[PDB]
Enzyme design. Structure first.
Site, PDB file in Angstrom:
ATOM      1  N   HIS A 209     -10.396  -2.829 -14.416  1.00  0.00           N
ATOM      2  CA  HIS A 209      -9.091  -2.389 -14.882  1.00  0.00           C
ATOM      3  C   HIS A 209      -9.064  -0.933 -15.350  1.00  0.00           C
ATOM      4  O   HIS A 209      -7.983  -0.401 -15.573  1.00  0.00           O
ATOM      5  CB  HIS A 209      -8.639  -3.295 -16.037  1.00  0.00           C
TER       6      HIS A 209
ATOM      7  N   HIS B 233       2.305   2.278  24.841  1.00  0.00           N
ATOM      8  CA  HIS B 233       2.611   2.448  23.414  1.00  0.00           C
ATOM      9  C   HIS B 233       2.585   3.905  22.983  1.00  0.00           C
ATOM     10  O   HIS B 233       3.509   4.356  22.327  1.00  0.00           O
ATOM     11  CB  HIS B 233       1.653   1.624  22.514  1.00  0.00           C
TER      12      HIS B 233
ATOM     13  N   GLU C 261       2.738  -4.021  -6.366  1.00  0.00           N
ATOM     14  CA  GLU C 261       2.755  -2.585  -6.674  1.00  0.00           C
ATOM     15  C   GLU C 261       3.126  -1.729  -5.472  1.00  0.00           C
ATOM     16  O   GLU C 261       3.880  -0.764  -5.599  1.00  0.00           O
ATOM     17  CB  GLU C 261       1.434  -2.076  -7.229  1.00  0.00           C
TER      18      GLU C 261
ATOM     19  N   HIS D 202       4.808   8.841  21.758  1.00  0.00           N
ATOM     20  CA  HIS D 202       4.891   7.398  21.929  1.00  0.00           C
ATOM     21  C   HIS D 202       6.168   7.029  22.669  1.00  0.00           C
ATOM     22  O   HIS D 202       7.249   7.038  22.084  1.00  0.00           O
ATOM     23  CB  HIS D 202       4.863   6.725  20.558  1.00  0.00           C
TER      24      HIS D 202
HETATM   25  C1  LIG Z   1      -3.519  -5.807  -8.753  1.00  0.00           C
HETATM   26  C2  LIG Z   1      -3.214  -6.254 -10.078  1.00  0.00           C
HETATM   27  N1  LIG Z   1      -1.988  -5.972 -10.587  1.00  0.00           N
HETATM   28  C3  LIG Z   1      -1.653  -6.353 -11.870  1.00  0.00           C
HETATM   29  C4  LIG Z   1      -2.559  -7.036 -12.659  1.00  0.00           C
HETATM   30  C5  LIG Z   1      -2.161  -7.356 -14.012  1.00  0.00           C
HETATM   31  N2  LIG Z   1      -2.115  -8.783 -14.376  1.00  0.00           N
HETATM   32  C6  LIG Z   1      -3.260  -9.457 -14.945  1.00  0.00           C
HETATM   33  C7  LIG Z   1      -4.113  -8.882 -16.109  1.00  0.00           C
HETATM   34  O1  LIG Z   1      -4.495  -7.563 -15.795  1.00  0.00           O
HETATM   35  C8  LIG Z   1      -5.404  -9.707 -16.195  1.00  0.00           C
HETATM   36  O2  LIG Z   1      -6.143  -9.639 -14.946  1.00  0.00           O
HETATM   37  C9  LIG Z   1      -3.312  -8.864 -17.439  1.00  0.00           C
HETATM   38  O3  LIG Z   1      -3.187 -10.199 -17.941  1.00  0.00           O
HETATM   39  C10 LIG Z   1      -3.929  -7.962 -18.534  1.00  0.00           C
HETATM   40  O4  LIG Z   1      -5.113  -8.550 -19.053  1.00  0.00           O
HETATM   41  C11 LIG Z   1      -2.926  -7.771 -19.679  1.00  0.00           C
HETATM   42  O5  LIG Z   1      -3.384  -6.708 -20.525  1.00  0.00           O
HETATM   43  P1  LIG Z   1      -2.772  -6.584 -22.008  1.00  0.00           P
HETATM   44  O6  LIG Z   1      -1.303  -6.507 -21.821  1.00  0.00           O
HETATM   45  O7  LIG Z   1      -3.248  -7.706 -22.825  1.00  0.00           O
HETATM   46  O8  LIG Z   1      -3.365  -5.216 -22.566  1.00  0.00           O
HETATM   47  S1  LIG Z   1      -2.921 -11.165 -14.797  1.00  0.00           S
HETATM   48  C12 LIG Z   1      -1.362 -10.911 -14.054  1.00  0.00           C
HETATM   49  C13 LIG Z   1      -0.391 -11.987 -13.618  1.00  0.00           C
HETATM   50  C14 LIG Z   1      -0.801 -13.386 -13.832  1.00  0.00           C
HETATM   51  O9  LIG Z   1       0.034 -14.227 -13.033  1.00  0.00           O
HETATM   52  P2  LIG Z   1      -0.646 -15.452 -12.272  1.00  0.00           P
HETATM   53  O10 LIG Z   1       0.434 -16.399 -11.951  1.00  0.00           O
HETATM   54  O11 LIG Z   1      -1.521 -14.925 -11.203  1.00  0.00           O
HETATM   55  O12 LIG Z   1      -1.609 -16.053 -13.409  1.00  0.00           O
HETATM   56  P3  LIG Z   1      -1.318 -17.156 -14.538  1.00  0.00           P
HETATM   57  O13 LIG Z   1      -0.824 -18.431 -13.885  1.00  0.00           O
HETATM   58  O14 LIG Z   1      -0.186 -16.592 -15.386  1.00  0.00           O
HETATM   59  O15 LIG Z   1      -2.578 -17.265 -15.287  1.00  0.00           O
HETATM   60  C15 LIG Z   1      -1.129  -9.594 -13.917  1.00  0.00           C
HETATM   61  C16 LIG Z   1       0.178  -9.042 -13.352  1.00  0.00           C
HETATM   62  C17 LIG Z   1      -3.835  -7.291 -12.059  1.00  0.00           C
HETATM   63  N3  LIG Z   1      -4.796  -7.905 -12.725  1.00  0.00           N
HETATM   64  N4  LIG Z   1      -4.126  -6.917 -10.792  1.00  0.00           N
HETATM   65  C1  LIG Z   2      -0.672   2.208   7.877  1.00  0.00           C
HETATM   66  C2  LIG Z   2      -0.916   2.538   9.249  1.00  0.00           C
HETATM   67  N1  LIG Z   2      -2.031   2.041   9.842  1.00  0.00           N
HETATM   68  C3  LIG Z   2      -2.331   2.353  11.152  1.00  0.00           C
HETATM   69  C4  LIG Z   2      -1.494   3.171  11.888  1.00  0.00           C
HETATM   70  C5  LIG Z   2      -1.897   3.500  13.238  1.00  0.00           C
HETATM   71  N2  LIG Z   2      -0.992   3.088  14.325  1.00  0.00           N
HETATM   72  C6  LIG Z   2       0.050   3.963  14.815  1.00  0.00           C
HETATM   73  C7  LIG Z   2      -0.170   5.460  15.164  1.00  0.00           C
HETATM   74  O1  LIG Z   2      -0.801   6.100  14.079  1.00  0.00           O
HETATM   75  C8  LIG Z   2       1.211   6.112  15.318  1.00  0.00           C
HETATM   76  O2  LIG Z   2       1.980   5.986  14.092  1.00  0.00           O
HETATM   77  C9  LIG Z   2      -1.062   5.621  16.424  1.00  0.00           C
HETATM   78  O3  LIG Z   2      -0.313   5.265  17.591  1.00  0.00           O
HETATM   79  C10 LIG Z   2      -1.648   7.041  16.605  1.00  0.00           C
HETATM   80  O4  LIG Z   2      -0.630   7.951  16.998  1.00  0.00           O
HETATM   81  C11 LIG Z   2      -2.739   7.023  17.682  1.00  0.00           C
HETATM   82  O5  LIG Z   2      -3.469   8.255  17.625  1.00  0.00           O
HETATM   83  P1  LIG Z   2      -4.366   8.681  18.892  1.00  0.00           P
HETATM   84  O6  LIG Z   2      -5.284   7.540  19.123  1.00  0.00           O
HETATM   85  O7  LIG Z   2      -3.486   9.024  20.015  1.00  0.00           O
HETATM   86  O8  LIG Z   2      -5.150   9.977  18.402  1.00  0.00           O
HETATM   87  S1  LIG Z   2       1.123   2.941  15.740  1.00  0.00           S
HETATM   88  C12 LIG Z   2       0.179   1.498  15.466  1.00  0.00           C
HETATM   89  C13 LIG Z   2       0.481   0.114  15.997  1.00  0.00           C
HETATM   90  C14 LIG Z   2       1.693  -0.038  16.821  1.00  0.00           C
HETATM   91  O9  LIG Z   2       2.012  -1.428  16.900  1.00  0.00           O
HETATM   92  P2  LIG Z   2       3.546  -1.852  16.788  1.00  0.00           P
HETATM   93  O10 LIG Z   2       3.652  -3.200  17.369  1.00  0.00           O
HETATM   94  O11 LIG Z   2       4.014  -1.593  15.410  1.00  0.00           O
HETATM   95  O12 LIG Z   2       4.258  -0.767  17.734  1.00  0.00           O
HETATM   96  P3  LIG Z   2       4.556  -0.802  19.311  1.00  0.00           P
HETATM   97  O13 LIG Z   2       5.362  -2.040  19.646  1.00  0.00           O
HETATM   98  O14 LIG Z   2       3.197  -0.927  19.987  1.00  0.00           O
HETATM   99  O15 LIG Z   2       5.206   0.485  19.596  1.00  0.00           O
HETATM  100  C15 LIG Z   2      -0.886   1.788  14.697  1.00  0.00           C
HETATM  101  C16 LIG Z   2      -1.940   0.749  14.323  1.00  0.00           C
HETATM  102  C17 LIG Z   2      -0.342   3.664  11.195  1.00  0.00           C
HETATM  103  N3  LIG Z   2       0.514   4.482  11.780  1.00  0.00           N
HETATM  104  N4  LIG Z   2      -0.069   3.327   9.913  1.00  0.00           N
END
Ligand SMILES: Cc1ncc(C[n+]2c([C@](O)(CO)[C@@H](O)[C@H](O)COP(=O)(O)O)sc(CCOP(=O)(O)OP(=O)(O)O)c2C)c(N)n1
Ligand SMILES: Cc1ncc(C[n+]2c([C@](O)(CO)[C@@H](O)[C@H](O)COP(=O)(O)O)sc(CCOP(=O)(O)OP(=O)(O)O)c2C)c(N)n1
Ligand SMILES: [Ca+2]
Ligand SMILES: [Ca+2]
Lengths: 675, 675
Positions: B476, B259, B413, B25
């Site tokens: 979950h 690129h 996360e 690149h």
């Molecule tokens: C990608 C992802 N990461 C973390 C969570 C965990 N999490 C979620 C849950 O999982 C429900 O969906 C948990 O409330 C579990 O039910 C708890 O399990 P126990 O401790 O009772 O065993 S909700 C949540 C954050 C909520 O913040 P928000 O501001 O989105 O919601 P609200 O205004 O407080 O209602 C967070 C951080 C998720 N659901 N998805």
């Molecule tokens: C999480 C993630 N998703 C997609 C890519 C793919 N990707 C990347 C690469 O993988 C290099 O790191 C690819 O250039 C591969 O080398 C191509 O493989 P071939 O087609 O030659 O076989 S770079 C890239 C986007 C670049 O946009 P930027 O604006 O970040 O970079 P620049 O200003 O154009 O230099 C994108 C979209 C990545 N590296 N990481």
């Protein structure tokens, strides 16, 4: 007022559901009941026809608040009752702890993993715009529906929502109306501890319109007005800031404690008494509320009735488009569409499976209008755009049109995955796809798993599948990736070896109605195989080279099938007779009859697997496994294969060792098990 | 000027490296050479001591531009030469196609997967702030270093960078200075097709300071001034907008073609001639440039020399803190720190392993100052904060201080995972951890895989590991998650069964220097096991219940070990004698001697695995596998276990079937293989 009574009913149903389960989340349902009431009053939907294609869609992105959603669906007379609410969070119920589209009538998507629902809403809105651009005509507004999304602070913290919101703003998706539950509370307490950004300023930077409702605990007039305002802004998605009190009405309102645990019994009593309900009664549904809601349902049903007549008149005026639309609404692909799939012979040139994929798309996109798709900034690398198609863009940009079929997702794999789920959720037989490198499908695991759980027929065009990509090196080369997705229930993971297998993979992906597909495709060229066909590859696994006196069978996928065939020749010189099995999709193979599977992987012969990635899973199909269980390397691809002994001689050596290991042993098919 | 000559040298080294490989690149290296020159001139570093703890750090988040980084490192006399540049992208070289910290001297982290590096930079800056708050005293600026990050449009599109940038702004990380390569080009062409947001407005909304450099192709004075300006803003991270031309100087400058592919030979010739270089020469290093760069190295080495004397004086004035700091810089934990690990007996009460984890953290955090960590908005659920500790926050907020040890990551996360990698990369023996539910570790897969490839000793505190969590349901409940991470090279995936095993898991996680850990922990209570100990569990797998006349051995993990023990009793009533093996970490077990492993999984006895998740991988250790290969359910956890027959009777039934299946068969250890 009846509106006030409805809001109280919703709140108390939600609280009572949580109470009965002694599990779940009362806070956000209490805070969002006024907004839910206001939004559902503005929404067009038929509880007796959940699939009406011109319905407004609602998505609860803060899925933990599902007692709210279930309460709305019950009150409106969906196929969900108070008896189902009483079974909230109980094994086998229609009211699981987070909404699941497979189980809950009126749940468009599966939420609970934060951030996903808003992205799904972006996809529903993208699909609606594409659908309307495709079918609407003067005096025929076939599609004019909105997408309403509720989301919380957690959804706004998850990076996937930033990706989708940036893209939605770019795409000027004016029929998307999202509502932020601005309650300043998450699980760890005040948002001041971790989330102090100016959300509104960020959304303006994406090109969204903003409406603020400062008292969303009570001001349903302002919430309704915000919707009206959003509908006037046709070239921007809108974020409505709903300033609410989490747990509104509870003794514990405005605290993290009310987020995620049942209220105390005395708290529920005082809620009921101050809202005019009986504190001794649970699951109350005042008949006034039912009546009010039924009026709105009856009006909506008359709107759908008129839509059906509009559709009939459309078919008269536009017979071709009308028949196409009917077919799609019936869930049917075009008759004999698969005759467009390319077919190859062993006399044809070697081709990389990424290029074979481009060729398939080039042939089938013109034949199947419900195919749309895109790439996450890897269009010229994944080879995902058919020449002569137009990008999906707002026409105002000059860069495409909403009738376009190719989506520029940008470097946004996770949102691409969740948007694909939304496009599938829209319906109308959409068969949609998204390209990236296989290794970066992992960035989207949150959404991919939900494709599987939700039973959506989405397709990942996942190129650069292995160390075969070469110089980009180990940060780009999958090792664990196929094992991860194969270990997920309900994912077809196709790794086609050649032209015919690539066509079979697409046949499966496009015909799918309930199973997401990942197509693992090569950067590097592969030969056309003697013995491959669409017919045989459509079985998921098949005997490529039959050897009736086999000393060993080599089972392989993708780029390693040709390697196995070359190893067979080396083995012949060593006095060892091999057969070869190609296993382009383990899930499809598993679904075949036991007799079919045994015909491919018989008893009485050692079986060696060969695939340049993790050996996990392979013991389902083999006695010994030759794989790659370490990270890759940066170099010319053939040199990497040589380093790791994925060569005809390296495979033959391991095959010979396998034959020797089983000398004097009784060998039964890996398909056999004790239970 | 010598500055102009240096910039040309950098550009041409990068271009020549790509040319020699015929891969890589050139575009971003051409566009960013002026900025790289300016930033490295401001940076304090010693090419002869890559681990000086008060160095400024540089991170190339747009890792595809690594020919630029390698050129800088070569010119400055790191352990990387022009001969290494000539081997760019070649098998086994020190110049792989994306930077790898294990292989490249002066690469702080492993980049290439977009979005990661900026997040790693947030972690390096977080660690620096925490470290400085812990050790600096009046007249003793032990730590005062900066974190410089280059990133591109792709990094800005990836949601992980939004997460980390929101958090970094919240944390007021004034020693973080990031530079956006604003070149308006990505792989799919103009950013107008997918990325039209107002980036600067978004970064202001996070609380970042902005400096714009409108002509970053030439204006190194302005780039240097931007750094000076950023250093004056001590309470905000800074984004420097570098408006550049991708491929600056190339005939193909300002296009997507520049690129990611080698330049044409005639293009390289005209680059050389217009910058005063010989078009017939490759890998030119003008001695002027070397001299200039060496002057800056010599100054930096004098700064480090003075720092070493400051450190010696610090140890005299602050003997306790000085000894602690020395120990950490030597990579050593406190002597006998592990005496703080809690120990349990079978007479102790049942405890959930999430709660056992809290207790461990409560005991070891006071003993081991280099432990810091946090949770992604799940603090009261993961139980990751030790009572009496202070949160890591800027003191200006009143919510914590930079000397704090507990991080409120918010619902982020993926960024948490990448920030953990940055904290580890800082060095000083940091042993850092991040809590979420096991199922949502999957949101961070991009970063987790890089923890493994980068060999960083980070720890995920991954609670709610299974259907044992109950009512939250299948969105979950992990199924595929352990298989995914176990299939990734170099991840220790601990699933402790009880108190003693949980202490062993932490012993491993904290002692780690090169292997990331995931601790899969329960929501639900588990009994203390007869036969467990820290000593035995530290072997990764061990015989819990030895049965010299075993008809079967049951191998299990986590919550299923107690289940296996109960099944053993049921089997005794059926006339079947079982042994039990506990396998709390498959990686640690695999690393034991062959003889040790055979003592646990001997020849001549059928072995059944039991774990309520995917059966993938389990054939390494068992002949038959009882697992869960479908999604879960929403209900009370014991009812879910009963539904899927993960009961003492269900396990016994399958054990009895396993014994019957192998009657009259010769059985060898699953550890045996043909090669
Ligand atoms: C990608 C992802 N990461 C973390 C969570 C965990 N999490 C979620 C849950 O999982 C429900 O969906 C948990 O409330 C579990 O039910 C708890 O399990 P126990 O401790 O009772 O065993 S909700 C949540 C954050 C909520 O913040 P928000 O501001 O989105 O919601 P609200 O205004 O407080 O209602 C967070 C951080 C998720 N659901 N998805
Ligand atoms: C999480 C993630 N998703 C997609 C890519 C793919 N990707 C990347 C690469 O993988 C290099 O790191 C690819 O250039 C591969 O080398 C191509 O493989 P071939 O087609 O030659 O076989 S770079 C890239 C986007 C670049 O946009 P930027 O604006 O970040 O970079 P620049 O200003 O154009 O230099 C994108 C979209 C990545 N590296 N990481
Ligand atoms: Ca909230
Ligand atoms: Ca760019």
């Amino acid at each position: 007022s009846v509106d006030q009574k409805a809001i109280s009913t919703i709140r108390l149903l939600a609280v009572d559901a949580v109470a009965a389960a002694n599990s779940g989340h009362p806070g956000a349902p209490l805070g969002l009941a006024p907004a839910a009431h206001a939004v559902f009053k503005k929404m067009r939907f038929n509880p007796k026809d959940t699939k009406w294609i011109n319905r407004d869609r609602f998505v609860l992105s803060n899925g933990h608040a599902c007692a709210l959603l279930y309460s709305m669906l019950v009150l409106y007379g969906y196929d969900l009752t108070v008896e189902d609410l009483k079974k909230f969070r109980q094994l086998g119920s229609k009211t699981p702890g987070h909404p699941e589209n497979t189980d809950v009538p009126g749940a468009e998507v599966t939420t609970g993993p934060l951030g996903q629902g808003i992205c799904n809403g972006v996809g529903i809105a993208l699909a609606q715009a594409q659908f309307a651009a495709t079918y609407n005509k003067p005096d025929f507004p076939i599609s004019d529906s909105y997408t309403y999304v509720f989301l919380g602070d957690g959804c706004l913290m998850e990076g996937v929502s930033s990706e989708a919101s940036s893209l939605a703003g770019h795409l000027q998706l004016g029929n998307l109306i999202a509502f932020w539950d601005d309650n300043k509370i998450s699980i760890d307490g005040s948002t001041e501890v971790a989330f102090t950004e100016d959300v509104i300023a960020r959304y303006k930077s994406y090109g969204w319109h903003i409406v603020e409702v400062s008292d969303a605990d009570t001001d349903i007039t302002a919430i309704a007005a915000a919707i009206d305002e959003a509908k006037k802004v046709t070239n921007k998605p809108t974020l409505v800031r709903l300033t609410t009190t989490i747990g509104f009405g509870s003794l514990a309102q405005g605290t993290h404690g009310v987020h995620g645990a049942p209220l105390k019994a005395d708290d529920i009593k005082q809620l009921k008494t101050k809202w005019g309900f009986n504190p001794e009664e649970s699951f109350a549904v005042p008949a006034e509320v039912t009546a009010s809601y039924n009026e709105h349902v009856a009006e909506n049903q008359k709107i759908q009735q008129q839509w059906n007549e509009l559709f009939a008149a459309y078919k008269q005026k536009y017979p071709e488009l009308g028949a196409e639309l009917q077919r799609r609404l019936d869930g049917k692909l075009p008759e004999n569409w698969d005759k467009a799939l390319p077919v190859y012979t062993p006399a044809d040139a070697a081709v990389a499976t990424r290029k074979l994929s481009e060729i398939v798309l080039s042939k089938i996109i013109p034949e199947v209008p419900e195919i749309i798709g895109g790439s996450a900034d890897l269009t010229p690398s994944n080879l995902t755009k058919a020449k002569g198609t137009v990008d999906f863009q707002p026409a105002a940009t000059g860069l495409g049109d909403y009738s376009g079929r190719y989506i520029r997702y940008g470097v946004r794999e996770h949102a691409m995955g969740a948007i694909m789920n939304g496009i599938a959720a829209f319906g109308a037989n959409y068969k949609n796809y998204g390209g990236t490198f296989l290794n970066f499908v992992s960035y989207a695991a949150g959404a991919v798993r939900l494709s599987a759980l939700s039973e959506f027929p989405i397709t990942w065009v996942a190129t650069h599948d292995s160390i075969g990509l070469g110089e980009d090196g180990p940060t780009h080369q999958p090792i664990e990736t196929l094992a991860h997705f194969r270990a997920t229930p309900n994912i077809s993971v196709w790794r086609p070896a050649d032209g015919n297998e690539t066509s079979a993979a697409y046949k499966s992906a496009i015909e799918s109605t309930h199973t997401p597909h990942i197509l693992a495709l090569t950067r590097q060229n592969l030969p056309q195989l003697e013995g491959s066909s669409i017919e045989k590859a459509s079985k998921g696994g098949y005997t490529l080279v039959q050897q009736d006196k086999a000393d060993i069978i080599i089972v392989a996928t993708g780029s390693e099938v040709s390697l196995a065939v070359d190893a067979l020749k080396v083995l012949e010189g060593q006095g060892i007779k091999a057969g070869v099995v190609s296993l382009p999709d383990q899930l499809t193979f598993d679904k075949q009859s036991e007799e079919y599977k045994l015909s491919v992987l018989p008893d009485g012969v050692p079986i060696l697997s060969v695939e340049v990635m993790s050996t996990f899973g392979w013991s389902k199909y083999s006695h010994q496994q030759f794989g790659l269980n370490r990270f890759g390397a940066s170099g010319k691809a053939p040199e990497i294969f040589k380093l790791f002994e994925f060569t005809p001689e390296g495979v033959a050596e391991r095959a010979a060792k396998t034959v020797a290991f089983y000398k004097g042993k009784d060998v039964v098919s890996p398909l056999r098990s004790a239970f």
